[PDB]
C-alpha cells in the first residue's frame, strides 16, 4: 500500500507513503552486483538483528526485504538532517546549547552501538536526522560491506573523505570504534565554526589537511604510526596548531573534549561513554531547532 512520493537521498532513498493511512517511511533501495544470487544469508542475519536493537538516537530499522538483485531497507522517516540545518544556520551559527545537545545525543547513540560491537564507519552531517522535538539520530550506517552485502561496485565513485579517521587513511586493516569518535569530532568542529574542518579532495590531500592542523604524527604522539601500511617517512613535517586556533570561539571545556575526540592514536581517543562524562556537558539541555519543513 506504500507508494514512492519523492526521492530524498542518493543506495537511493525515497519518501514512501501509505495511500490509505498516510503513514510515511524512508525506503532505501540498494542494488547488488549480481542479477541472480541475492544477498547471502549471513548478511541478512546480521542486518535483521538491528531491528531489535533500538536507541532514541539511532534511526529505527522497520523491515528488511531482499530479492535476486536488490536489498530494501525500510526506516522511520525524519524530515531534516544536520547538513541542511547547518546550511540554513550557516550565516549565524547553530546556538551553543543546541550544538551541545546534539553532540551529547550522538555520543549516546554511538555508545549504544559500540557497546553492541556495531560501528557506523561513515558519519557525515547529511547522515544525522533531526526533528522538531530536538532529537538527532544516527542514520545511513556504512555496514553493507562489513556485513557482506554484495553491493554494486561503482568504478568512478566519488567518495567524501572529510570525516575519515587518520588510521583509515594510513591503511589500518582493522577499524575500531574510535573511527566514529573522530568523525563526530570533525562534525562538532563544523557546527562550531560553520565550516568543514578537513575538506580534502583525495586521500593524500585529506591526510595533509589533518597534518597541517594537528601536526604530522610521529611515534611520540601516535606510537605505532610509522608502522602503518601507508605511512611514509617522507611525509612533510608540519607543526601542531593549538585548538584555540582550530575552533574559535569554543570555550575551554569544549576545546578540551574536541582535542580528545581528535586524538591521533585510536587507542587513546576518548570513548563515546567516557565523553558523556566530560565537563563540557555539565549544563547540557534539550532545546528545539526552528525548522522550516
Ligand atoms: O543505515 C543503513 O543504511 C544500514 C545499512 C545496512 N546495510 O546495508 O547492510 C545495514 C544497517 C543499516 N542501518 C542500521 C540502523 C540501526 C538500527 N538499529 C541499530 C542498532 C545498532 Cl547497535 C546499530 C545500527 C542500527
From Swiss-Prot:
InterPro entries: CDK (IPR050108), Kinase-like_dom_sf (IPR011009), Prot_kinase_dom (IPR000719), Protein_kinase_ATP_BS (IPR017441), Ser/Thr_kinase_AS (IPR008271). It catalyses: L-seryl-[protein] + ATP = O-phospho-L-seryl-[protein] + ADP + H(+); L-threonyl-[protein] + ATP = O-phospho-L-threonyl-[protein] + ADP + H(+). The active site is at residue 122. ATP binds at residues 8-13, 28, 76-78, 81, 124-127, 140. Its EC number is 2.7.11.22. Serine/threonine-protein kinase involved in the control of the cell cycle; essential for meiosis, but dispensable for mitosis. Phosphorylates CABLES1, CTNNB1, CDK2AP2, ERCC6, NBN, USP37, p53/TP53, NPM1, CDK7, RB1, BRCA2, MYC, NPAT, EZH2. Triggers duplication of centrosomes and DNA. One of its GO terms (biological process) is centrosome duplication. It is found in: Cytoplasm, Cytoskeleton, Microtubule organizing center, Centrosome; Nucleus, Cajal body; Cytoplasm; Endosome. Binds 2 Mg(2+) ions. It comes from Homo sapiens (Human). This is Cyclin-dependent kinase 2. Found in a complex with CABLES1, CCNA1 and CCNE1. Interacts with CABLES1. Interacts with UHRF2. Part of a complex consisting of UHRF2, CDK2 and CCNE1. Interacts with the Speedy/Ringo proteins SPDYA and SPDYC. Interaction with SPDYA promotes kinase activation via a conformation change that alleviates obstruction of the substrate-binding cleft by the T-loop. Found in a complex with both SPDYA and CDKN1B/KIP1. Binds to RB1 and CDK7.
Amino acid at each position: 500500500n506504500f507508494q514512492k512520493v519523492e526521492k530524498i537521498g542518493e543506495g537511493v532513498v525515497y519518501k514512501a507513503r501509505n495511500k490509505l493511512t498516510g503513514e510515511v517511511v524512508a525506503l532505501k533501495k540498494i542494488r547488488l552486483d549480481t542479477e541472480t544470487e541475492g544477498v547471502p544469508s549471513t548478511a541478512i542475519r546480521e542486518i535483521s538483528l538491528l531491528k531489535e536493537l533500538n536507541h532514541p538516537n539511532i534511526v529505527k530499522l522497520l523491515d528488511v526485504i531482499h530479492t535476486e538483485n536488490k536489498l530494501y531497507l525500510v526506516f522511520e522517516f525524519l524530515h531534516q538532517d544536520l547538513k541542511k540545518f547547518m546550511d540554513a544556520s550557516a550565516l549565524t551559527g547553530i546556538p551553543l546549547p543546541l550544538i551541545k545537545s546534539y553532540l551529547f545525543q550522538l555520543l549516546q547513540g554511538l555508545a549504544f552501538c559500540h557497546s553492541h560491537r556495531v560501528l557506523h564507519r561513515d558519519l557525515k552531517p547529511q547522515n544525522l536526522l533531526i526533528n522538531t522535538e530536538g532529537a538527532i539520530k544516527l542514520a545511513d550506517f556504512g555496514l553493507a560491506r562489513a556485513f557482506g552485502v554484495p553491493v554494486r561496485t561503482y568504478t568512478h565513485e566519488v567518495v567524501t573523505l572529510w570525516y575519515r579517521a587518520p588510521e583509515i587513511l594510513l591503511g589500518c586493516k582493522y577499524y575500531s570504534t574510535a573511527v566514529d569518535i573522530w568523525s563526530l569530532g570533525c562534525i562538532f568542529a563544523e557546527m562550531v565554526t560553520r565550516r568543514a574542518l578537513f575538506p580534502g579532495d583525495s586521500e593524500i590531500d585529506q591526510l595533509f589537511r589533518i597534518f597541517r592542523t594537528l601536526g604530522t604524527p610521529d611515534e611520540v604522539v601516535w606510537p605505532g604510526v610509522t608502522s602503518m601500511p601507508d605511512y611514509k617517512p617522507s611525509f612533510p613535517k608540519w607543526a601542531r596548531q593549538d585548538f584555540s586556533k582550530v575552533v574559535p570561539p569554543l570555550d575551554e571545556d569544549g576545546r578540551s573534549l574536541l582535542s580528545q575526540m581528535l586524538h591521533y592514536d585510536p587507542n587513546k581517543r576518548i570513548s563515546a561513554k567516557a565523553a558523556l562524562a566530560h565537563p563540557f556537558f555539565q549544563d547540557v539541555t534539550k532545546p528545539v531547532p526552528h525548522l522550516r519543513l
